[PDB]
Amino acid sequence: AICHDGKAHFPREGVFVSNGTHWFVTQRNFYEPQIITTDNTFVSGNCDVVIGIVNNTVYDPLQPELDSFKE
Amino acid sequence: VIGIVNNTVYDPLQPELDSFKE
Amino acid sequence: WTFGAGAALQIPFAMQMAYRFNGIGVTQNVLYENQKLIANQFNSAIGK
Ligand SMILES: *[C@@H]1O[C@H](CO[C@@H]2O[C@@H](C)[C@@H](O)[C@@H](O)[C@@H]2O)[C@@H](O[C@@H]2O[C@H](CO)[C@@H](O[C@@H]3O[C@H](CO)[C@@H](O)[C@H](O[C@H]4O[C@H](CO)[C@@H](O)[C@H](O)[C@@H]4O)[C@@H]3O)[C@H](O)[C@H]2NC(C)=O)[C@H](O)[C@H]1NC(C)=O
Ligand SMILES: *[C@@H]1O[C@H](CO)[C@@H](O[C@@H]2O[C@H](CO)[C@@H](O[C@@H]3O[C@H](CO)[C@@H](O)[C@H](O)[C@@H]3O)[C@H](O)[C@H]2NC(C)=O)[C@H](O)[C@H]1NC(C)=O
Ligand SMILES: *[C@@H]1O[C@H](CO)[C@@H](O[C@@H]2O[C@H](CO)[C@@H](O[C@@H]3O[C@H](CO)[C@@H](O)[C@H](O)[C@@H]3O)[C@H](O)[C@H]2NC(C)=O)[C@H](O)[C@H]1NC(C)=O
Numbered sequence: 001a002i003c004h005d006g007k008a009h010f011p012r013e014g015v016f017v018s019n020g021t022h023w024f025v026t027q028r029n030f031y032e033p034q035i036i037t038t039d040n041t042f043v044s045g046n047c048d049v050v051i052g053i054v055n056n057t058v059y060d061p062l063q064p065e066l067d068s069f070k071e
Numbered sequence: 072v073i074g075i076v077n078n079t080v081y082d083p084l085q086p087e088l089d090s091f092k093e
Numbered sequence: 094w095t096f097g098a099g100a101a102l103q104i105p106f107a108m109q110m111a112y113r114f115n116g117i118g119v120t121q122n123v124l125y126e127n128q129k130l131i132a133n134q135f136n137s138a139i140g141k
């Protein structure tokens with residue numbers, strides 16, 4: 001899973017992988033990394049339960065649009 | 072549909088948009 | 094199950110269990126949150 005803001009994100013359909021520096025989410029039968037966003041994942045619980053969770057940032061697709069909207 | 076029921080469905084984007092505007 | 098189709102691909106057993114749980118229609122968060130209980134139940138069943 002991924003720790004973003006104190007919440008545990010799990011992939012909707014796929015697995016989290018790391019190429020050494022960055023984290024992506026990809027389907028389980030063909031490597032095509034995708035940026036980890038709220039659409040690829042779903043939240044469940046907090047960071048204190050899962051074993052092996054890792055820190056990372058989860059991009060929010062609505063955030064850039066909201067920023068332009070604010071501007 | 073037979074058996075449907077009143078209830079409210081909360082839209083996640085609604086609080087974000089309304090909070091931005093307010 | 095990968096070794097049943099082609100070259101065996103390593104995967105942590107917890108992740109494999111999440112895959113199986115998703116296969117039986119249960120969200121993998123259930124396992125990732127109850128892993129200790131599932132492991133204890135499996136060990137107890139094997140002992141039995
Ligand atoms: C692990 O993965 C990350 C992500 O990069 C992506 O995966 C890599 C494995 C590799 O295939 C990349 O081609 C692929 O995009 C690697 O980290 C770097 O990420 C940046 C941006 O994604 C890539 O961009 C490259 O490096 C510069 C980044 O600014 C720039 O010269 C080029 O990017 C162009 O486009 C970006 C878009 O944001 C723009 O900002 C730039 O200014 C520029 O126009 C260039 O394409 C890098 O390829 C990735 N690698 C490096 C060294 O920067 C990471 O390297 C990779 N590590 C390993 C061991 O695989
Ligand atoms: C993912 O990120 C969170 C937040 O960084 C990690 O949780 C840990 O939270 C504490 C406090 O928010 C961070 O500092 C802590 O301070 C207390 C003060 O008493 C100290 O006792 C702790 O040892 C800790 O230093 C802490 O940086 C942070 N830990 C990490 C590794 O980031 C959470 O651990 C991260 N998830 C992982 C590593 O799987
Ligand atoms: C299962 O659910 C449906 C609801 O979609 C029930 O439809 C029944 O239709 C009657 C109208 O004739 C509804 O009005 C009430 O009926 C009862 C008799 O069940 C009557 O005594 C009342 O005075 C009133 O007219 C009724 O609400 C509704 N019945 C129920 C239980 O919901 C259908 O009957 C239901 N069947 C069972 C076994 O629950």
Ligand SMILES: *[C@@H]1O[C@H](CO)[C@@H](O[C@@H]2O[C@H](CO)[C@@H](O[C@@H]3O[C@H](CO)[C@@H](O)[C@H](O)[C@@H]3O)[C@H](O)[C@H]2NC(C)=O)[C@H](O)[C@H]1NC(C)=O
Pocket residue numbers: 074075076077
């Ligand atoms: C879910 O909620 C809506 C709103 O109550 C229900 O639609 C129906 O809407 C009418 C008017 O808003 C409610 O009164 C009705 O007015 C008409 C026109 O005057 C009249 O001919 C009817 O006899 C009735 O008095 C009506 O109560 C309301 N129906 C219900 C059950 O609340 C809709 O039916 C609700 N659906 C379910 C499964 O509860």
Ligand SMILES: *[C@@H]1O[C@H](CO)[C@@H](O[C@@H]2O[C@H](CO)[C@@H](O[C@@H]3O[C@H](CO)[C@@H](O)[C@H](O)[C@@H]3O)[C@H](O)[C@H]2NC(C)=O)[C@H](O)[C@H]1NC(C)=O
Pocket residue numbers: 130133134
């Ligand atoms: C879901 O059902 C299972 C039944 O297989 C429950 O697993 C076990 O439930 C017992 C009842 O408490 C737990 O006993 C434990 O005893 C130890 C003694 O030191 C202590 O850690 C606690 O007092 C604990 O109660 C046991 O930990 C637990 N897991 C096992 C046997 O592997 C489970 O509690 C149920 N979960 C629910 C209803 O949320």
Ligand SMILES: *[C@@H]1O[C@H](CO)[C@@H](O[C@@H]2O[C@H](CO)[C@@H](O)[C@H](O)[C@H]2NC(C)=O)[C@H](O)[C@H]1NC(C)=O
Pocket residue numbers: 051052
């Ligand atoms: C898998 O095992 C390794 C090794 O235990 C873990 O990495 C850490 O490595 C140091 C030294 O080898 C140990 O002292 C730590 O206990 C290890 N941390 C943990 C949590 O075990 C690695 O983290 C383990 N991965 C998972 C998901 O448990």
